Amino acid sequence: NASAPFNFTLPPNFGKRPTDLALSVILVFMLFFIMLSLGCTMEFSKIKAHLWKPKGLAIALVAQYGIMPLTAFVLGKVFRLKNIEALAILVCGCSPGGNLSNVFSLAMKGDMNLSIVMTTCSTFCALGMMPLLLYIYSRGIYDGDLKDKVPYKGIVISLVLVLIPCTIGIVLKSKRPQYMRYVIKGGMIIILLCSVAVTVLSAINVGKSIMFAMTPLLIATSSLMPFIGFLLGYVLSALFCLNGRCRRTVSMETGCANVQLCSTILNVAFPPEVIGPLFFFPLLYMIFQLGEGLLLIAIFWCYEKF
């Protein structure tokens, strides 16, 4: 069909919509509140204990940056994907773990201090050494340098906005732990309005509902990526003979990945008109990995009942 750009187009106002800015700022505030509530239920003792024993940190790093980009490259090679799709899936695989991974860790409730130290060290290591692995694994795709286009200020900004609420919660619990129920109720209400806000988003913010015309095989690989990540994390944890507490948290931290940086790099590298439904692909990937997370939540609770 020769080489033509997709008919998918974005509204001119979408670049600086006040509604989009309001959604971004309320999402940032929401992440701040949920991170504060999440770091409330941790203490520095286990943080220091897990930092002194970096075996879990080492296994998480070797799973996230050693095999995950390799399996992303292999999956792109075997499914005969296009250059843009292969680059997108490779960047998604190379991404470090996100904060929603820590939210699912709270849902599973296993070794939260290890989870937070894992995610902060993963983000730091990503910042340090993601462009080199991206250049190594992107031979034949995007001959451009791309080193100066991966976000750097965004990474440190996210790291600070994650660390500060956690430290605030830890120091609040350590020094004066008498206002627990109020902040937990605030967590419940922030979660409720988060459900309301995500419903509002999915209703009146997506637009151009043509994601179903997206290629089924890229849907299949976006489906398989979180599942294979979860399975690889679980087995790699199992064969290194640690305690049973860390299995689920390390496996599901390895499986989950961030998608904001992938969207930013795809948007800055290519025009919106060139990219078709792959622009909405990160949203689909995040939604489906959340679905897998909920499925494993249900499986874990069903197992623990029996």
Epitope: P5, K82, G140
Partner: antibody, heavy 121, light 113 residues
């Protein structure tokens, strides 16, 4: 359809800086990249480099590192190419071509009328 | 780098004869991930800018006559005209874009006497 419009013939001294203008207004200028091809008389085509107007990303051929300089203007939908280092043998015909670029430039479907440059006294 | 070599580089044919040029490139410029076989054939009539004929070394650009067929894989490629006419006399380059944009030496078409 769309056509690629060249600046026109240019006559320049051996020591000077010459800028070439290539204009195309038939599509979204940021969706495609613009290449430059140098053709000495009867010596065949030779690639120079391409520029991506969306992010102002430029890639150069091996020999054109010293003199190759590509700049683009989104507002004017024009691509500019500058040499700033000229010799008597540098005179040739330069073409600007448009190619779709996803990860690798595919093929130059459309070409300009060409620019003839002469270097002498 | 990749260097493109064309063997004939010069030939003269009559109306009925077929030319069947061939340029062997340097190595196997076939993409395993996407079975596209990156290659493009261009035609440049004298005093005119080059015109694209074949892309992906197998697919012909719309608007070209059906007589222009290109078949090849790996390193060997061939463009055939079959029933060549008087307006097909030009220079063809079989440009490649697998790794770096390099053009071939070129072939010249003439008329026999």
């Amino acid at each position: 359809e769309v056509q690629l419009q060249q600046s026109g013939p240019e006559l320049v001294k051996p020591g000077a800086s010459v800028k070439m203008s290539c204009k195309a207004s038939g599509y979204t200028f940021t969706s495609y990249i613009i290449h430059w091809v140098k053709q000495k008389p009867g010596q065949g085509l030779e690639w120079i480099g391409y520029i991506n107007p969306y992010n102002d990303g430029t890639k150069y051929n091996e020999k054109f590192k010293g003199k190759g300089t590509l700049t683009s203007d989104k507002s004017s939908s024009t691509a500019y190419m500058e040499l700033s280092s000229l010799t008597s043998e540098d005179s040739a015909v330069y073409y600007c071509a448009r190619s779709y670029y996803d990860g690798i430039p595919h093929y130059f479907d459309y070409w300009g009328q060409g620019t003839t440059l002469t270097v002498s006294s | 780098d990749i260097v493109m070599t064309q063997s004939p580089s010069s030939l003269a044919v009559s109306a009925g004869e077929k030319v069947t040029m061939s340029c062997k490139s340097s190595q196997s410029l076939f993409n395993s991930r996407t079975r596209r076989n990156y290659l493009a054939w261009y035609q440049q009539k004298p005093g005119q800018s080059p015109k694209l004929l074949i892309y992906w070394a197998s697919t012909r650009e719309s608007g070209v006559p059906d007589r222009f067929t290109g078949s090849g894989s790996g390193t060997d490629f061939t463009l055939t005209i079959s029933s060549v006419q008087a307006e097909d006399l030009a220079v063809y380059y079989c440009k490649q874009s697998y790794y770096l944009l390099t053009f071939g030496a070129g072939t010249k078409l003439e008329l026999k006497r």
